[PDB]
Design an enzyme around this catalytic site. Sequence first.
Site, PDB file in Angstrom:
ATOM      1  CD1 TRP A  58      14.148   3.975 -10.896  1.00 10.24           C
ATOM      2  CD2 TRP A  58      15.056   5.584 -12.158  1.00 10.24           C
ATOM      3  NE1 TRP A  58      15.299   3.471 -11.448  1.00 10.24           N
ATOM      4  CE2 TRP A  58      15.874   4.436 -12.233  1.00 10.24           C
ATOM      5  CE3 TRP A  58      15.428   6.721 -12.877  1.00 10.24           C
ATOM      6  CZ2 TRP A  58      17.042   4.394 -12.996  1.00 10.24           C
ATOM      7  CZ3 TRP A  58      16.589   6.671 -13.646  1.00 10.24           C
ATOM      8  CH2 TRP A  58      17.377   5.519 -13.697  1.00 10.24           C
ATOM      9  N   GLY A  84      -4.714   4.374  -6.450  1.00  9.38           N
ATOM     10  CA  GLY A  84      -4.888   4.073  -5.042  1.00  9.38           C
ATOM     11  C   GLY A  84      -4.050   2.914  -4.541  1.00  9.38           C
ATOM     12  N   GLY A  85      -4.713   1.859  -4.082  1.00  9.22           N
ATOM     13  CA  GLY A  85      -4.046   0.752  -3.426  1.00  9.22           C
ATOM     14  C   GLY A  85      -4.047   0.910  -1.914  1.00  9.22           C
ATOM     15  CD1 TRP A  86      -2.015  -1.310   3.059  1.00 10.78           C
ATOM     16  CD2 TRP A  86      -4.179  -1.871   3.133  1.00 10.78           C
ATOM     17  NE1 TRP A  86      -2.368  -1.446   4.386  1.00 10.78           N
ATOM     18  CE2 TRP A  86      -3.693  -1.796   4.455  1.00 10.78           C
ATOM     19  CE3 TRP A  86      -5.521  -2.206   2.926  1.00 10.78           C
ATOM     20  CZ2 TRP A  86      -4.505  -2.044   5.562  1.00 10.78           C
ATOM     21  CZ3 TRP A  86      -6.319  -2.465   4.029  1.00 10.78           C
ATOM     22  CH2 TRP A  86      -5.806  -2.380   5.329  1.00 10.78           C
ATOM     23  CD  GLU A 128      -6.988  -1.922  -1.396  1.00 10.13           C
ATOM     24  OE1 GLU A 128      -6.402  -2.349  -0.383  1.00 10.13           O
ATOM     25  OE2 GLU A 128      -6.797  -2.404  -2.529  1.00 10.13           O
ATOM     26  CE1 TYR A 129     -11.425  -2.543  -0.241  1.00 13.17           C
ATOM     27  CE2 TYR A 129     -10.542  -2.588   1.986  1.00 13.17           C
ATOM     28  CZ  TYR A 129     -10.649  -3.140   0.722  1.00 13.17           C
ATOM     29  OH  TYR A 129      -9.943  -4.288   0.413  1.00 13.17           O
ATOM     30  CE1 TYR A 198      -6.770  -9.287  -2.963  1.00 13.31           C
ATOM     31  CE2 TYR A 198      -7.527 -10.623  -4.800  1.00 13.31           C
ATOM     32  CZ  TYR A 198      -7.053  -9.430  -4.302  1.00 13.31           C
ATOM     33  OH  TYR A 198      -6.852  -8.370  -5.155  1.00 13.31           O
ATOM     34  CG  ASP A 199      -5.325  -9.834   1.548  1.00 15.28           C
ATOM     35  OD1 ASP A 199      -4.630 -10.876   1.491  1.00 15.28           O
ATOM     36  OD2 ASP A 199      -4.972  -8.749   1.027  1.00 15.28           O
ATOM     37  CD1 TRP A 346      -1.692  -9.048  -5.014  1.00 18.30           C
ATOM     38  CD2 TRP A 346      -2.632  -7.330  -6.113  1.00 18.30           C
ATOM     39  NE1 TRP A 346      -0.919  -7.933  -4.792  1.00 18.30           N
ATOM     40  CE2 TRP A 346      -1.476  -6.865  -5.451  1.00 18.30           C
ATOM     41  CE3 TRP A 346      -3.395  -6.427  -6.862  1.00 18.30           C
ATOM     42  CZ2 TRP A 346      -1.054  -5.534  -5.532  1.00 18.30           C
ATOM     43  CZ3 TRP A 346      -2.972  -5.102  -6.937  1.00 18.30           C
ATOM     44  CH2 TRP A 346      -1.817  -4.672  -6.275  1.00 18.30           C
TER      45      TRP A 346
HETATM   46  N1  JUK Z   1      -0.265  -4.113   4.545  1.00 20.26           N
HETATM   47  C1  JUK Z   1      -1.576  -4.610   4.557  1.00 20.26           C
HETATM   48  C2  JUK Z   1      -2.144  -5.058   3.331  1.00 20.26           C
HETATM   49  C3  JUK Z   1      -1.494  -5.011   1.885  1.00 20.26           C
HETATM   50  O1  JUK Z   1      -2.267  -4.557   1.055  1.00 20.26           O
HETATM   51  N2  JUK Z   1      -0.120  -5.392   1.287  1.00 20.26           N
HETATM   52  C4  JUK Z   1       1.131  -5.973   1.788  1.00 20.26           C
HETATM   53  C5  JUK Z   1       2.147  -5.922   0.589  1.00 20.26           C
HETATM   54  C6  JUK Z   1       1.625  -5.771  -0.619  1.00 20.26           C
HETATM   55  C7  JUK Z   1       2.855  -6.005  -1.638  1.00 20.26           C
HETATM   56  C8  JUK Z   1       3.824  -6.613  -0.933  1.00 20.26           C
HETATM   57  O2  JUK Z   1       3.145  -7.087   0.364  1.00 20.26           O
HETATM   58  C9  JUK Z   1      -3.497  -5.537   3.364  1.00 20.26           C
HETATM   59  C10 JUK Z   1      -4.190  -5.590   4.616  1.00 20.26           C
HETATM   60  C11 JUK Z   1      -5.537  -6.086   4.718  1.00 20.26           C
HETATM   61  O3  JUK Z   1      -6.200  -6.532   3.561  1.00 20.26           O
HETATM   62  N3  JUK Z   1      -6.182  -6.122   5.943  1.00 20.26           N
HETATM   63  C12 JUK Z   1      -7.464  -6.600   5.987  1.00 20.26           C
HETATM   64  C13 JUK Z   1      -8.182  -6.663   7.221  1.00 20.26           C
HETATM   65  C14 JUK Z   1      -7.569  -6.230   8.386  1.00 20.26           C
HETATM   66  C15 JUK Z   1      -6.242  -5.743   8.303  1.00 20.26           C
HETATM   67  C16 JUK Z   1      -5.572  -5.710   7.004  1.00 20.26           C
HETATM   68  N4  JUK Z   1      -4.251  -5.218   6.952  1.00 20.26           N
HETATM   69  C17 JUK Z   1      -3.556  -5.155   5.787  1.00 20.26           C
HETATM   70  N5  JUK Z   1      -2.248  -4.679   5.738  1.00 20.26           N
HETATM   71  C18 JUK Z   1      -1.588  -4.174   7.013  1.00 20.26           C
HETATM   72  C19 JUK Z   1      -0.822  -5.171   7.879  1.00 20.26           C
HETATM   73  C20 JUK Z   1      -1.389  -6.013   8.790  1.00 20.26           C
HETATM   74  C21 JUK Z   1      -0.231  -6.712   9.365  1.00 20.26           C
HETATM   75  C22 JUK Z   1       0.885  -6.193   8.738  1.00 20.26           C
HETATM   76  O4  JUK Z   1       0.506  -5.290   7.887  1.00 20.26           O
END
Ligand code: JUK
Length: 377
Positions: A58, A84-86, A128-129, A198-199, A346
């Site tokens: 869309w 890709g992406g998470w 990832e990854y 980050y993260d 990002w």
């Molecule tokens: N969803 C995610 C995301 C994510 O890419 N985007 C979120 C979106 C993106 C656009 C709007 O917000 C990244 C990570 C991450 O880098 N991690 C690193 C190390 C260990 C765990 C982990 N988990 C992640 N998780 C699961 C998660 C954990 C708790 C709740 O969900």
Amino acid sequence: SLLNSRYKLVCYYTNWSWYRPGIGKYSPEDIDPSLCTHIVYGFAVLGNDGLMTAHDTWSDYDNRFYERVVEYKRYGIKVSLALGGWNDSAGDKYSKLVNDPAARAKFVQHAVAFLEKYGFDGLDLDWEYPKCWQVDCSKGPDSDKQGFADLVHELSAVLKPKGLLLSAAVSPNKMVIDAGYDVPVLARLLDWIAVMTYDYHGQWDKKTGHVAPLYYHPDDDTTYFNANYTIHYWMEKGTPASKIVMGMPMYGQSFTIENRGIHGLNIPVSDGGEPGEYTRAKGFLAYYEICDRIRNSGWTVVKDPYQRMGPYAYKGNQWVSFDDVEIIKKKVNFIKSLNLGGGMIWALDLDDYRNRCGQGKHPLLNAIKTELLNPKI
Ligand SMILES: Nc1c(C(=O)NC[C@@H]2CCCO2)cc2c(=O)n3ccccc3nc2[n+]1Cc1ccco1
Ligand SMILES: *[C@@H]1O[C@H](CO)[C@@H](O)[C@H](O)[C@H]1NC(C)=O
């Protein structure tokens, strides 16, 4: 200008930022072409037939979002499509692809045709990854490393003769780097490596921490969960400085702290922070959501006087860590000091592009650009 400088500034665009209310809506024409040398479109996904396909027909097709972002080539910006992406990395499909030479060979020719059809300048790989699927190193086989390295070679062999770019977004975590990446192969073939510095911390830790520390902090559980270690480790593993772009977050990781009473680092956490009204994701807040909480809702800000990491902010049982302009300038001076290829963000739609907070439009991204263009280090 950034384009005439020695640095890249790689900006991630996200198609799903369109589906946000009010001022949180972001569209292709909201991209500021003075702020990026490269735009990367997140995301295309891996289809069930093993071929790259549009994630959101869309927007991507029916509303011509691919064309509307490829529009920015007219400014001299290079526009790549990310695969890709998470979310797309949750299962085994990328591992199945990279471990199958015949599947890789079919994927590569179709992928290049896909890019050329829509006018993209290159492909960005965002699995990832490899091996550590969604960071879990127990999930994938060790052969993901060789398979990904061969996918990168096979893509490079088709893209490079056509003048098309190939890049990857990569983990900052030592164990994931060790398990998933044949660093010399990637460093030799990729035009840049966007290290996702980050993260490092989030609600999954069960305690508060900074989304993106620059330097080691004495209370850290490890010596390796900071951008300084990560960038030096990519170089130690064989990556030239010119191939690295250092990621910087335009958002924060939010936490619900167990006890209003203590509000510092490494304090117990019961859950992610309450979702923001625009981004609507537990544990995540855009910078424009954070700055409004500070400016108009009285959140208390704690800065690091040694500038090893950016600030955190809290109110009641809510706590968020993020990057401000001050730490961004420090990080960009770090990029320049190591002669890195440049910076990456990002993502475009998470900075305060509307000037909701009165610091000016795009306060974080403009801080990156100004520091990159400042000759002094
Ligand atoms: N969803 C995610 C995301 C994510 O890419 N985007 C979120 C979106 C993106 C656009 C709007 O917000 C990244 C990570 C991450 O880098 N991690 C690193 C190390 C260990 C765990 C982990 N988990 C992640 N998780 C699961 C998660 C954990 C708790 C709740 O969900
Ligand atoms: C950054 O990392 C390098 C190599 O790991 C180290 O020598 C240096 O002391 C670090 N910088 C700090 C801790 O400020």
